[PDB]
Design a protein around this motif. Structure first.
Motif, short mmCIF file in Angstrom:
data_model
loop_
_atom_site.label_atom_id
_atom_site.label_comp_id
_atom_site.label_asym_id
_atom_site.label_seq_id
_atom_site.Cartn_x
_atom_site.Cartn_y
_atom_site.Cartn_z
N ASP A 244 40.78 37.26 41.86
CA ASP A 244 40.56 36.54 40.83
C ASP A 244 39.19 36.09 40.65
OD1 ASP A 244 40.77 33.59 39.67
OD2 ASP A 244 42.39 34.47 38.70
N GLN B 269 38.37 32.70 40.76
CA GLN B 269 38.56 31.46 41.51
C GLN B 269 38.83 31.79 43.14
OE1 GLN B 269 37.38 28.87 40.09
NE2 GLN B 269 38.69 28.06 38.34
N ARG C 135 28.87 37.93 42.47
CA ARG C 135 30.35 38.88 42.48
C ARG C 135 30.12 39.97 43.69
NH1 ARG C 135 32.10 43.14 37.83
NH2 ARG C 135 33.63 43.28 39.52
N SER D 278 42.18 40.78 37.42
CA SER D 278 42.12 40.94 35.85
C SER D 278 40.72 41.23 35.84
CB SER D 278 41.79 39.54 35.31
OG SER D 278 43.01 38.56 35.28
N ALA D 279 40.65 42.11 34.60
CA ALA D 279 39.40 42.39 33.86
C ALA D 279 38.16 42.74 34.92
CB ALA D 279 39.06 40.97 33.42
N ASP D 280 38.56 43.94 35.70
CA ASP D 280 37.94 45.11 36.25
C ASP D 280 37.20 44.54 37.60
OD1 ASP D 280 38.99 46.44 34.64
OD2 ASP D 280 37.51 47.87 33.99
N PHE D 281 37.62 43.41 38.11
CA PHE D 281 37.08 42.97 39.40
C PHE D 281 37.80 43.55 40.42
CE2 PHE D 281 35.17 38.35 39.50
CZ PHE D 281 34.42 38.82 40.62
N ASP E 49 47.51 44.61 36.26
CA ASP E 49 46.96 43.59 35.52
C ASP E 49 47.93 42.15 35.14
OD1 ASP E 49 43.81 43.62 34.87
OD2 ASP E 49 44.61 45.80 34.63
#
Ligand code: GNP
Lengths: 421, 430
Positions: A149, A151, A195, A226-229, A252
């Motif tokens: 995530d 967070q 990141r 999520s979103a290619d992390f 996902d």
């Protein structure tokens, strides 16, 4: 087909025997496990048991010497019944325990199973290391959960009907570009460094967990976020070795919060976990789904069971290893009456006692209904499987009923009842 | 800042470009005024990800977010020629919808945003947008009308035509009357594109203005009212986020009433209090006071990090409330194909909190022990026993009885994604 869940009384059964063998609780240091591999020869063990007897005879300390002679003489006494080692081997369990019912009778198990090779165990310690047949029919750790995530991250495991989460951290990576002047761009650079620090710290604690001693503990490992992390996790330098190799699924999830997270593990299975015992998917779910359809397709625990099992009309039977229902026999005359693991009334159903007639209604005894369902199902053309309450639905079964539910083949109607109008 | 400065939450399907549109509303209020962001808008606009229709300077900002979830970092707003607006921008398959309801402010007005077009009407007539659950959470207290903006009214094949808008108004207006809400004095519409603008000023020559005589979007919001001089109703502050520096930092909207520096603030969920060391407003900051309707970034002196979590609300000791673990409820189930069995896992939607819930047991139905049939729910006879249930969740969640107040005490249930039930918590238990 795979018998999954049918397997689960059987798996369970072994398990007493593994704890009782390993434990042998009874005190004293007189417990012998002898497992003899297929094609070894039985007197090489009989001669080692006799050379150990002759040594045991030198101890001369009345209690201790008598335990070890009583232990060696019991395994030796059983070994004679077998001619040869059979195909598949021999397992032998002997020793003096804190037996019960002042009836004594040291434990004596002696059998042929199917295929423990080159294990060759003789130990008289606290524990017999019976292993590698026990490694071979492994059952380990199961599926790996690693959660990105923005967070914070999460690491856990779902293993059979063991889910465990208990190992996490969090991040504020730098998301606040800052305000007050400076620049533009600078944040985006600070964002990509911070990141990268999460791609190092998540992937390392995942290496520090899931890959324990020179191998991944778990068979399978799912990356969710999520979103290619996670795609920058999976194709990376920092994560790779032997773990990149294991990844079954990339799931996902939404706001990533626990539901999403579960749905994640869920969709997952299907071709992974493996064995055929713990995991179920496709099979477990079908049982529940198929009952949903107001196709009254449920036996679920507390009303219809034995009767329907005697009368064909069941596709898959769902029972639990911890079932508190059994069969009792002895009541009424000119015939027979059967008791089910006696509840608040079954235990004291002494009411059926026709004092003014003789009809003795004394709550039977105790037999186990679990084991019978695992030895009969072909005559009825139906089936049988087993499970646990380790979960939400699980706890329903205990409260709604006890621990036995069935899956009628095709749409049959909810068994009519007085309560029903 | 001080008060009269909205409560607005966007809602819409994830595809609806709602983040592009909410970014274009944030995008330097004063109008243009922007010696850095005019240079950023000079093309930058995107890779294939959020994809591109002019509205951007913000669509490539999704790109790097890594992304597919969220473009408007649970963050925006602006001012107009009336007042300031918070924004809070629902899901790109995020949680910023949780962020509204039980979080940052009960909208005086939400907003709905929809994207009429071929491959968008198909996914818009599924209709299961970050409108749907995402206005029900959103409505466990309040948030309504919303106007409705009809985005994507230039790209598809519309080429600035005068059709489809009314066709969508009819279908969307039967979709707002559903459940049982209020009338239509509160349900206007506005054509937009995110692509360009329109909603803040009518100073476009768009091709809508040859036929459309009406006020702009902001004027149909501005039909409400203002107030003045901060310090009006009770103080409340939902946490959007927390992290720490010298003192803890928290981010979040203020729901009602006032924060100055050097007041005490109480967090009931934890049972702790703190002094706020600073307040950042939301616009040009210089050390000044705030209002329900801006945020505040705040600094927190003398409390721990752990003590506050997002979705909690701070107040003064004066007009506060309370909450507990598992609970009993009277839930009313609709028509659904699935029945709730005793124990079944639903997702609850109180507030910010969407969580998995076991409805362990079924204690009474109409008046009997049975599975939760009740398709159209109560005992049709005297006291409406829809069902009485016990709901259990992974961690203890901050919930009160509906009797003290209907907010925290109402919630929806949905099994897969069809809403099976709604109820009220009757009693608290450990
Ligand atoms: N033609 C057209 N396409 C649009 C418009 N707005 C958005 N889109 C398209 O729709 C896609 C998704 O929009 P987006 O606002 O990110 O949806 P969302 O899921 O509501 N965003 P979020 O989840 O972050 O709130 C974008 O990639 C964009 O190409 C619009 O006004 N017109």
């Amino acid at each position: 087909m795979d018998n999954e869940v049918e397997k689960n009384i059987e798996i369970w059964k072994v398990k007493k025997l593994v704890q009782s063998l390993e434990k042998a609780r009874g005190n004293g240091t007189s417990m012998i496990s002898l497992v003899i591999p297929p094609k070894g020869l039985i007197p090489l063990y009989q001669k080692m048991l006799t050379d150990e007897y002759g040594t045991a005879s030198n101890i001369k300390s009345r209690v201790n010497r008598l335990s070890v002679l009583s232990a060696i003489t019991s395994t030796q006494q059983k070994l004679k019944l077998y001619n040869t080692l059979p195909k598949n081997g021999l397992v032998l369990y002997c020793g003096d325990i804190i037996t019960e019912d002042g009836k004594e009778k040291k434990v004596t198990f002696d059998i042929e199973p199917y295929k423990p090779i080159n294990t060759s165990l003789y130990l008289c310690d606290n524990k017999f290391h019976t292993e590698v047949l026990s490694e071979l029919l492994q059952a380990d750790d199961k599926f790996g959960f690693i959660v990105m995530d923005g967070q914070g991250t999460l690491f856990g495991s779902v293993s059979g009907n063991t889910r465990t989460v208990l190992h996490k951290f969090t991040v504020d990576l730098p998301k606040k570009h800052g305000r007050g002047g400076q620049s533009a761009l600078r944040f985006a650079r600070l964002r990509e460094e911070k990141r990268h620090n999460y791609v190092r710290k998540v992937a390392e604690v995942a290496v520090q967990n899931f890959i324990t001693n020179d191998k991944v503990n778990v068979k399978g490992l799912i990356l969710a976020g999520s979103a290619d992390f996670k795609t920058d996790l999976a194709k990376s330098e920092l994560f790779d070795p032997r773990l990149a190799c294991k990844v079954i699924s990339i799931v996902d999830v939404s706001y990533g919060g626990e539901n999403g997270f579960n749905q994640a593990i869920e969709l997952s299975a299907e071709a992974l976990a493996n064995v055929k015992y713990v995991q179920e998917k496709k099979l477990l779910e079908a049982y529940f789904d198929e009952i949903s359809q107001d196709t009254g397709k449920f036996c679920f625990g507390i009303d219809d069971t034995l009767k329907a099992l005697d009368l064909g009309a069941v596709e898959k039977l769902i029972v639990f290893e911890n079932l508190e229902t059994i069969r009792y026999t002895f009541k009424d005359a000119e015939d027979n009456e059967v008791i089910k693991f006696a509840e608040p009334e079954a235990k004291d159903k002494s009411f059926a006692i026709d004092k003014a007639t003789g009809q003795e209604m004394d709550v039977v005894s105790e037999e186990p209904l679990i084991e019978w369902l695992a030895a009969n199902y072909k005559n009825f053309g139906a089936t049988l499987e087993f499970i646990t309450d380790k979960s939400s639905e699980g706890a329903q079964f205990v409260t709604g009923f006890g621990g036995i539910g069935a899956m009628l083949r095709y749409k049959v109607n909810f068994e009519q009842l007085v309560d029903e109008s | 800042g001080g008060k009269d400065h909205v409560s607005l939450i966007f809602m819409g399907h994830v595809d609806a470009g709602k983040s592009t549109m909410g970014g274009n509303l944030l995008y330097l209020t004063g109008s243009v005024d922007k010696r850095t962001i005019e240079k950023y808008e000079r093309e930058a606009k995107d890779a294939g990800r959020q994809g591109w229709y002019l509205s951007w300077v913000m669509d490539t900002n999704k790109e790097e977010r890594n992304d597919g979830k969220t473009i408007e970092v649970g963050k925006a707003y602006f001012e107009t020629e009336k007042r300031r607006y918070t924004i809070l921008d629902a899901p790109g398959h995020k949680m910023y919808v949780s962020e509204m309801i039980g979080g940052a402010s009960q909208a005086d007005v939400g907003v709905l945003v929809i994207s009429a077009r071929k491959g968008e009407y198909e996914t818009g007539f599924e209709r299961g947008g970050q409108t749907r659950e995402h206005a029900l959470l959103a409505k466990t207290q309040g948030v309504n009308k919303m106007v409705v903006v009809v985005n994507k009214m230039d790209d598809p094949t519309v080429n600035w035509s005068k059709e489809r808008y009314d066709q969508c108004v009819s279908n969307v207006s039967n979709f707002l009357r559903a459940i049982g809400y209020n009338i239509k004095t509160d349900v206007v519409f506005m054509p937009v594109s995110g692509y360009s603008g329109a909603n803040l000023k009518d100073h476009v020559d768009p091709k809508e203005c040859p036929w459309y005589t009406g006020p702009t979007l902001l004027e149909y919001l501005d039909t409400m009212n203002h107030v003045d001089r901060h310090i009006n109703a009770p103080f409340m502050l939902p946490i959007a986020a927390k992290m720490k520096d010298l003192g803890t930092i928290v981010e979040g909207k203020i729901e009602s009433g006032h924060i100055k520096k050097g007041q005490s603030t109480l967090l009931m969920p934890n049972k702790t209090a703190v002094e706020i060391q600073n307040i950042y407003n939301e616009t040009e900051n210089e050390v000044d006071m705030a209002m329900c309707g801006e945020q505040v970034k705040l600094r927190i002196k003398g409390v721990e990090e752990e003590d506050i979590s997002p979705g909690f609300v701070l107040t003064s000791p004066k007009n506060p409330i309370k909450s507990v673990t598992k609970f009993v409820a009277q839930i009313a189930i609709v028509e659904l194909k699935s029945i709730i069995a005793a124990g079944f896992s639903c997702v609850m939607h109180v507030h910010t909190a969407i969580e998995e819930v076991h409805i362990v047991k079924l204690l009474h139905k109409l008046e009997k022990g049975t599975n939760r049939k009740s398709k159209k729910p109560p005992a049709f006879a005297k006291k409406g026993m829809k069902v009485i249930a016990v709901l259990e969740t992974e961690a203890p969640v901050c919930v009160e009885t509906y009797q003290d107040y209907p907010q925290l005490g109402r919630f929806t249930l949905r099994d897969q994604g069809t809403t099976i039930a709604i109820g009220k918590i009757v009693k608290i238990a450990e």
